[PDB]
C-alpha cells in the first residue's frame, strides 16, 4: 500500500483549511482506496498465515509419529 | 486496526472545510496513529508468515525422507 511517508504527505496536505475542495475530496479518496486495499491484503495474509499454521501442524505431528514408528521397527 | 467503517467515518468528517481546526488536526492524528499501528501489525504478520513458509518447506524435506525410509523397509519386508 502507501508508504508511511506517502501517507504522511497526504495528512499534511489535508491539514490546510484553505486546500481547494477538489483536492481535499481527491486526497480523501486516495486514503479511502488505499485503506480498502490494505485491509484486503491484510485479511488475505491472515488467512494465508492460518493455512500455513495448520499445514505446519500436520507436518510436525506426523514428523514425530513417523520418527517414533521407525524406531519401533528397528532402531 | 480501525474497521473500514470507523475509518470512513473519519474521512467523512474531514471532508467538511468548515470543521474546526482542532477537530481537523485531531482527526488527521487519528489517521496517522492508526496507519502506523496498521503497518506494524502488517509487517509482523509478514515476518511470521515468511518464517512459517520456511519451516513448512523444511518439514516437507524431512517428512519426504521419513516416508521413503518407512517405505524401503516395508518393501524389504
Swiss-Prot record, chain A:
Superkingdom of source: Viruses
Resulting phenotype, residue 55 to K: Forms procapsids which have incorporated the connector. Defective in producing infectious virions
Keywords, comma-separated and alphabetical: Coiled coil, DNA-binding, Late protein, Viral capsid assembly, Viral release from host cell
Alphabetized GO MF terms: DNA binding
This protein's GO CC annotations: viral scaffold
Coiled coil: 39-61
Gene Ontology biological-process annotations: virion assembly
Cleaved signal peptide residues: none
Similarity comment: Belongs to the phi29likevirus scaffolding protein family.
Functional description taken from the UniProt entry: Scaffolding protein involved in the icosahedric procapsid assembly. Coassembles with the capsid proteins to form the procapsid. The scaffolding protein is found within the capsid as a serie of concentric shells. During DNA packaging, the scaffolding protein molecules are released from the procapsid.
SUBUNIT field: Homodimer. Interacts non-specifically with DNA; probably binds DNA in the early stages of DNA packaging.
Name of the molecule in the record: Capsid assembly scaffolding protein
High-level lineage: Viruses, Duplodnaviria, Heunggongvirae, Uroviricota, Caudoviricetes
Amino acid at each position: 500500500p502507501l508508504k508511511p511517508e506517502e501517507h504522511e504527505d497526504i495528512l499534511n496536505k489535508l491539514l490546510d483549511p484553505e486546500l481547494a475542495q477538489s483536492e481535499r475530496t481527491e486526497a480523501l479518496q486516495q486514503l479511502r482506496v488505499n485503506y480498502g486495499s490494505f485491509v484486503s491484503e491484510y485479511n488475505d495474509l491472515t488467512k494465508s498465515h492460518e493455512k500455513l499454521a495448520a499445514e505446519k501442524d500436520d507436518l510436525i505431528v506426523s514428523n514425530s509419529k513417523l520418527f517414533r514408528q521407525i524406531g519401533l521397527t528397528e532402531k
